[PDB]
Design a protein around this nucleic acid. Structure first.
Ligand code: ZN
Ligand code: ZN
Lengths: 88, 110, 99, 83, 93, 148, 99, 82, 109, 95
DNA sequence: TCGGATGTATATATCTGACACGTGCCTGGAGACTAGGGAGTAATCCCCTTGGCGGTTAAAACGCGGGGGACAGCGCGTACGTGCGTTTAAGCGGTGCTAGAGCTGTCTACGACCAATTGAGCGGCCTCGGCACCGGGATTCTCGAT
DNA sequence: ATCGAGAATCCCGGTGCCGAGGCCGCTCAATTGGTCGTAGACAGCTCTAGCACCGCTTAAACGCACGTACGCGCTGTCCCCCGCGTTTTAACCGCCAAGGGGATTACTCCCTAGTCTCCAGGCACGTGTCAGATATATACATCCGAT
């Protein structure tokens, strides 16, 4: 099963996990929220305050930041939310 | 930041900023040292030290030791893809090497 | 009855045992004597700080280990598993040391 | 206090150990001598610089910083002893 | 006696910031001192050569930024540039 | 584009969940300029007092912290002349996952015990850490003549 | 009747002819186009001084010539006369470029 | 915009660069590989050249920029300035 | 030698000593530049230039050309030993390379 | 307007040439190469003397600093001959 | 596949010295103020960089025949790994001596700084010779054929 | 072994052009002279660390035997680079044109050096305690001969 549309949101901006990223601390947030919480914050987890600097480098080096399989579940279970989120 | 506290705090860093300012002045790097450069350089230094110390701490936790020793630093530096390229020529004292055996030398599956 | 490993296994075991450690391999006093000899050759009547001898030993060991890594790469490249002097000479000639 | 043939202090087992750490499985009997040669050359390019610093500062003890500077000059920066 | 300067206390602060339990040996502290001094020398020297090439006479922030773009490899470069820009922006205001 | 939804979530939070011994709201129609009211905690030398404070949400909220400052004049070790506050999760420790309620509870905890480590006004900090009787005397007098 | 040299002589003649000269070997305009392409990749909307393109060409040619010297050394070391990609990869791995 | 220009480094040009290096016999899998490594080298020099040009707030990459990039990498060049 | 004359001629050199002094002062190499350092440095630079020009002039006379070109500088630098050890990494533009065919590649009976 | 002036070691290299080979000219590209070579060697020696005077906490680049930088920077015979030439020139200048 | 045999990882007391923390102070960092020149902004100007023909022709692309080198397979005879008994000297601890690194104080000769001033060096012009180039001729490797 | 045809390469002479070397005018930086603060040389004192020596333990070096895996040479195959002739694509060159942006000059102001005063951040030093090294005794994994 999958958590409802409520928990499918980003735990920061309360919006859908558009292109989510799964941090080493098991947390998740949408790609814009991620890139903000890394390029304008202290490179730490917004949930449990865990630095992911090295992991961030190691994975963006391979462009393996986005979690593809969760994103596929979101696009097959709640596609219209992702599409209405796609414009803005 | 209106805070008239030590410039380290006013920049949010941990590395000293006045000391970096002096080292940039007395070091004959240039005639004038702008007031922004020491803060920037202290931030960069702190960030690099944070990276290396985090990786070394991870390695030391892996080897079940609660105190980083040069071997863990060598492991952390050589296992990362960028910290190795930045320190390609450096030689860590008491660092050992990365454990790896060439594939051709391993015994014949018989 | 005398149980002896086939030739080629104690070598790998030693490779693992020595890559898994960090201590110095060249014994201390002979290397110190060699360093003092080269010194008295260059400028006579010298003294050495123990830290300087240790730094020399660390640098020499790291250099030799790198050279043996590249030599082993050469020897494997020539479809061999033994390192021969032409391997070391090729490693140093390519690396840009002596030309 | 002269000395002779001290490079034979770098014995054959020591070179075998150095080669094991480098990941070498089988060593030819003509490596040892060769290696010693190489080793000596390396030292005669570091000590010569180290002493050159000591001669300059008008000292008689080659300090650790002298050796570290001599190394850094050759492109083999060494961490752990200073600078 | 004479008093020497080192980055020991600051390295220890950063450690206790990113790993609240693991200490650090003395020799590792020496290695970190040497590493910080080396990166300092590299960055400052490259910024000085930039100032000299462009005929300027002062090492502003942007010279340090370009030196960091030059020395550090790609991803470290981006992250450190962002971090330094953030620190300066916070220090100014 | 996300700041509007973030402030919407925050106002809905303060609606459905009032902060502990506190309240807040938009002082004007604009969402980025806010006013809040804090009640004096018991375990704080400012018992019974009520203080109004102004909130300025930044442009890159939440990833940038919102500047809060006490508008009422308070003689506090962490409150300067105009009423600015020195809080680490307000300058650098600010995690954008935090809500209003968490920063309000943190400033409450600071009101419970002033932090003169990096103070704004030195003499009030030194009289707080030197002789506490004169300190809570003057703070109680302030929170009775200005907060009442 | 058609007189043709044995395979292996025109190669040596070309080696002599090209080592006895200095002009550029990579044609100008294709190399210039390649450089401009990599440029627009890095920072868009750039212009180039002809001297800079020439300096790039000189550096690239000297680098490739050095790499081929060391590659040929490797290929000879492996008891061959043909250079193969593993030779170039070994040369670059030993030289310390990519590791 | 430009694309597929590494094929401008043709096969005979690499043959010439190989002859000057002293190579008698080349294998058909070298050409491709060569292009590869050459590209890398360029992507390591131009990147620094641009970094200099972007610092001085210019839009042309002068020869001194390339020379400084090379010298910074360790491939000092004589003949254009420095 | 006491004199009131251009420091170059007074020192017995050909390179400028005033220009080298200025470059040592305005280059941020150190705070103060001793009065005897620029002379030493100009002398060393002059010696090295004379060395390379000697060898290059010889190499140019070999090719029957009476005017040094980069090729001859490259030949004179690579053929020598100390100079080639000093300029090991330097690349001489338009310099060509030493004629060197490996022995194994040569024909055989 | 008027073009700004660019310094170079052209005339000095030409003087040294006419001392060594009194009949052999030199072409412009060769002149640029020799000029860049002089600049590079000057930079190496000066920077080495700078680091050397900074190691011992001195503040002055004396002649001894240049002498030791030369001893550190050049191969054997070149180091010996260049140190000889430098000492000769300095003593002739000071006397 | 298979049971001995050996090296390796693992769990447990223990003990010691390296690390983390508290303290006095003191020297270097922070704060206020003044001056001046370095850098930024504006304007302009002309050097040279991009873009574009169009013709020639050197050079790349393609295909073909073959021969010589890459590579696999066998073999064989030595060089080298493994193990062991023996001899050597490294390592350690403790002690004694002093050579020399390091620090402080004093004093002056050396280098910075500044105003003048005057010639070396740089920009621009230019002209004759060194080198490039072409054409022919001399010769010299190369290959096949005996 | 040889010798002769066939391409290829080296010499040589005539012609031509553009650039290397030299001349001239003029700006600006190198030189001279004087003044002045201080970096550095030098004497003196201290006391840290390097050198030399000795005696004991035991780990490592060593010399030797021996079996064997592999380094090296030979043979044979076949396929894939080389040389070459032919055709087709595009580099190169000489030319022209537009304009953009690098380089230059003038002005202005604010950012940083320099100075003085003041005080707490950090450093040398001293002290306690637990992380890790050590020793011991196990279980466990892996190698190897023999089925
Ligand atoms: Zn989000
Ligand atoms: Zn987390």
């Amino acid at each position: 099963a999958i958590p409802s549309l409520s928990e499918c949101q980003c735990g920061i901006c309360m919006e859908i996990l558009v292109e989510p990223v799964t941090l080493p601390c098991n947390h998740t947030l949408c790609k814009p929220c991620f890139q903000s919480t890394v390029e304008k914050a202290s490179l730490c987890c917004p949930f449990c305050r865990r630095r992911v600097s090295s992991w961030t480098r190691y994975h963006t080096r391979r462009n393996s930041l986005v979690n593809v399989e969760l994103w596929t579940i979101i696009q097959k279970h709640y596609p219209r939310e992702c599409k209405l989120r796609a414009s803005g | 930041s209106a805070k008239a506290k030590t410039r380290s705090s006013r920049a949010g860093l941990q590395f000293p900023v006045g000391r970096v300012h002096r080292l940039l002045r007395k070091g004959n790097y240039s005639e004038r040292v702008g007031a922004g450069a020491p803060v920037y350089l202290a931030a960069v230094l702190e960030y690099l030290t944070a990276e290396i110390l985090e990786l070394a701490g991870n390695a030391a936790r892996d080897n079940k030791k609660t105190r980083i020793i040069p071997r863990h630093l060598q492991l952390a530096i050589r296992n990362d893809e960028e910290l190795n390229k930045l320190l390609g020529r450096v030689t860590i004292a008491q660092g050992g090497v990365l454990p790896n055996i060439q594939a051709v030398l391993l015994p014949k599956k018989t | 009855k005398p149980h002896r490993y086939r030739p080629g296994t104690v070598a790998l075991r030693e490779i693992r045992r020595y890559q898994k450690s960090t201590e110095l391999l060249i014994r201390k006093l002979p290397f110190q004597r060699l360093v003092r000899e080269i010194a008295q050759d260059f400028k006579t009547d010298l003294r050495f700080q123990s830290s300087a001898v240790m730094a020399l030993q660390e640098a020499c060991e790291a250099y030799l280990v790198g050279l043996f890594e590249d030599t082993n790469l050469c020897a494997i490249h020539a479809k061999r598993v033994t390192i021969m002097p032409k391997d070391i000479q090729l490693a140093r000639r390519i690396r840009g040391e002596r030309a | 206090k002269v000395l002779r043939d001290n490079i034979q202090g770098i014995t054959k087992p020591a070179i075998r150990r150095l080669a094991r750490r480098g990941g070498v499985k089988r060593i030819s009997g003509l490596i040892y001598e060769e290696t010693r040669g190489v080793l000596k050359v390396f030292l005669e390019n570091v000590i010569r610089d180290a002493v050159t610093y000591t001669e300059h500062a008008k000292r008689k003890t080659v300090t650790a910083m002298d050796v570290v500077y001599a190394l850094k000059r050759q492109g083999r920066t060494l961490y752990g002893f200073g600078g | 006696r004479s008093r020497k300067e080192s980055y020991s206390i600051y390295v220890y602060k950063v450690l206790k910031q990113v790993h609240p339990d693991t200490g650090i040996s003395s020799k590792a502290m020496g290695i970190m001192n040497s590493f910080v001094n080396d990166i300092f020398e590299r960055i400052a020297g490259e910024a000085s050569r930039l100032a000299h090439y462009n005929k300027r006479s002062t090492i502003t922030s942007r010279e340090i930024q370009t030196a960091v773009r030059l020395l550090l490899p790609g991803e470290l470069a981006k992250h450190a540039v962002s971090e330094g820009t953030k620190a300066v922006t916070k220090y100014t205001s | 584009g996300s700041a509007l939804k973030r402030i919407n979530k925050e106002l809905s939070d303060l609606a459905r969940d009032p902060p502990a011994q506190c309240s807040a709201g938009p002082v004007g129609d604009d969402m980025f300029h806010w006013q809040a009211t804090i009640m004096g905690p018991n375990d704080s030398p400012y018992q019974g007092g009520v203080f109004f404070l102004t909130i300025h949400f930044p442009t890159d909220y939440p990833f940038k912290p919102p500047k809060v400052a006490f508008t009422t004049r308070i003689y506090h070790p962490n409150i300067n002349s105009n009423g600015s506050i020195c809080l680490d999760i307000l300058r650098s420790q600010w995690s954008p996952a935090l809500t209003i309620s968490k920063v309000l509870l943190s400033i409450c905890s600071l009101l419970c015990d002033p932090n003169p480590d990096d103070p704004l006004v030195p003499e009030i900090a030194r009289i707080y850490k030197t002789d506490r009787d004169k300190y809570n005397r003057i703070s109680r007098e302030w929170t009775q003549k200005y907060a009442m």
